[PDB]
């Protein structure tokens, strides 16, 4: 579900907890994609939680996004530098909102 080319096709509009945020972002309904090594489309994430339950290195943590039409929290890749590219998260997300890319 997430654009595999976001890193080159969306402008970086900001930073969040050590990771970049890829625009556009128009809160609270449009929040864009968070992260570079491990990218999560906040506009697609429905807060299923499988990715967070699946990551062996705990890259993801719940992040509140009140008033987003898709969910009031999401998986924020705050510990993306720790990713070991097992690709578990990418396979289990029910909306395919995650894209991982070796630096
Ligand atoms: S690829 Fe593996 S390690 Fe990297 S985030 Fe996804 S689950 Fe965690
Ligand atoms: S829905 Fe959101 S929580 Fe994880 S499994 Fe998909 S990104
Ligand atoms: Zn973030």
Curated annotation (Swiss-Prot):
Annotated Gene3D superfamilies: 3.30.70.20
InterPro entries xref list: 4Fe4S_Fe-S-bd (IPR017896), 4Fe4S_Fe_S_CS (IPR017900), Fd_Zn-bd (IPR009157), Fe-S_Ferredoxin (IPR050572)
Region described as N-terminal extension: 1-36
Cofactor note: Binds 1 [3Fe-4S] cluster.
Binding site for [4Fe-4S] cluster: 55, 83, 86, 89
Cofactor(s) it depends on: [3Fe-4S] cluster; [4Fe-4S] cluster; Zn(2+)
Domain spans labelled 4Fe-4S ferredoxin-type: 37-65, 74-103
Record-listed N6-methyllysine modification sites: 29, 101
Binding positions ([3Fe-4S] cluster): 45-46, 51, 93
GO molecular function annotation: 3 iron, 4 sulfur cluster binding; 4 iron, 4 sulfur cluster binding; electron transfer activity; oxidoreductase activity; zinc ion binding
Keyword 4Fe-4S: yes
Entry-linked Pfam families: Fer4_10
Highest taxon of the lineage: Archaea
Binding site for Zn(2+): 16, 19, 34, 76
Entry comment on modification after translation: Lys-29 was found to be 95% monomethylated and Lys-101 was found to be 10% monomethylated.
Keywords, sorted A to Z: 3Fe-4S, 4Fe-4S, Electron transport, Iron, Iron-sulfur, Metal-binding, Methylation, Repeat, Transport, Zinc
Keyword 4Fe-4S: yes
Biological role: Ferredoxins are iron-sulfur proteins that transfer electrons in a wide variety of metabolic reactions. The 3Fe-4S cluster is reduced by a flavoprotein with NADH oxidase activity from the same organism.
Protein name in UniProt: Zinc-containing ferredoxin
Source species of the chain: Acidianus ambivalens
Organism lineage string: Archaea, Thermoproteota, Thermoprotei, Sulfolobales, Sulfolobaceae
Gene that specifies this protein: zfx
């Amino acid at each position: 579900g997430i654009d595999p080319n976001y890193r080159t096709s969306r402008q970086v509009v900001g930073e969040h907890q050590g990771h970049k945020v890829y625009g556009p972002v128009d809160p609270p309904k449009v929040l864009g994609i968070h992260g570079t090594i491990v990218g999560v489309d906040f506009d697609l994430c429905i807060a299923d939680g499988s990715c967070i339950t699946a990551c062996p290195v705990n890259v993801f943590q719940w992040y509140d996004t009140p008033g987003h039409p898709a969910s009031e929290k999401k998986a924020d890749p705050i510990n993306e530098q720790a990713c070991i590219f097992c690709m578990a998260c990418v396979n289990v997300c029910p909306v395919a909102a995650i894209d991982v890319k070796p630096p």
